[PDB]
């Protein structure tokens, strides 16, 4: 499906339907400040096409939303290319949220998780975040219903050791947390435990095929997951390969070429040669 740009949804649900035909959000997704929404507004609402967000996901003050299991059932990767103060996932002051329910979330490349001040929030102790983030050291999961000890969490599920005890791994009463053998690393596996291709990230429709990945570990090009963009293509938004012409079209209303990447701006020590979008180093101090 489509690549949609970063979104910022506030006040009304109307604008949320802009996500309807979408596979990747190239940017962040913020859903916030919905004070008059009620559970009935979310009973019939789903975006099953969404597989990946390149930056971060932020949910703040969205009233009436009880679970995300119907909203983002297939969200598999949050890349964390840009973060919200070190976080790739932010659940803050989500009054009414009873569970996360992101049962397809396999990997958070880059950042950490901040789930704070969610009265009603359970199904947190049941999640093994070490399967999703390399660093759980910087997670900040506090002041939720889960803190009190009396979340009647009820889950078959692959219990793992977090403290000194094995604890069940599930997202909701009807969804276990997927765990792949350690040998699969982050590539994901099939229901039968067979590793996905090494260029996949999190999940695949078939094993050992880089055109059958749910998401890419490295970069995406012409239906396929690739280790690097080959010439003449450029690395874009740290997830896809684009041609010069694409980067140029962006620039012309402000993107530049540097080290085989199409990037927002020239890095320090460089200025932009105008005729070919190319960052060239500075003869003496840089323009200012």
């Amino acid at each position: 499906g489509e690549v949609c740009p970063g979104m910022d949804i506030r006040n009304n649900l109307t604008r949320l339907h802009e996500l309807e035909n979408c596979s990747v959000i190239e940017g962040h997704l913020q859903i916030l400040l919905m004070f008059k929404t009620r559970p009935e507004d979310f009973r019939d609402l789903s975006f099953p096409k969404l597989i990946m967000i390149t930056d971060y996901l932020l949910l703040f003050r969205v009233y009436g939303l009880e679970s995300l299991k119907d909203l983002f059932p297939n969200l598999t990767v949050i890349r964390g290319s840009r973060l919200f103060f070190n976080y790739a996932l932010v659940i803050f002051e989500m009054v009414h949220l009873k569970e996360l329910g992101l049962y397809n979330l396999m990997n958070i490349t880059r950042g950490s998780v901040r789930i704070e001040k969610n009265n009603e929030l359970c199904y947190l102790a049941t999640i093994d975040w070490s399967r999703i983030l390399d660093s759980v050291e910087d997670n900040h999961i506090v002041l939720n219903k889960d803190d009190n000890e009396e979340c009647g969490d009820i889950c078959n599920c692959p219990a793992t050791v977090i403290n000194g005890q094995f604890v069940e791994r599930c997202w909701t009463h009807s969804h276990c947390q997927k765990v792949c053998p350690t040998i699969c690393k982050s590539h994901g596996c099939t229901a039968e435990g067979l590793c996905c291709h090494s260029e996949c990230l999190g999940n695949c429709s078939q094993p050992d095929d880089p055109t059958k990945c749910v998401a890419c570990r490295n970069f995406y090009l012409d239906g396929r997951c690739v280790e690097t963009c080959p010439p003449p293509y450029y690395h874009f938004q740290d997830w896809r390969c684009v041609n010069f012409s694409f980067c140029q079209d962006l620039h012309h209303k402000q993107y530049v070429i540097h080290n085989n990447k199409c990037i927002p701006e020239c890095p320090s020590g460089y200025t932009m040669n105008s005729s070919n979008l190319l960052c060239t180093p500075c003869l003496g101090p840089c323009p200012k």
Binding site: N11, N12, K117
Partner: peptide, 21 residues
């Protein structure tokens, strides 16, 4: 003012909604 600011802001905007670009 902390969390109350979010609430104080709602008292103020209300029907008119919040702002973004």
């Amino acid at each position: 003012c902390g969390s109350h600011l979010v609430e104080a802001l709602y008292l103020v905007c209300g029907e008119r909604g919040f702002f973004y670009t």
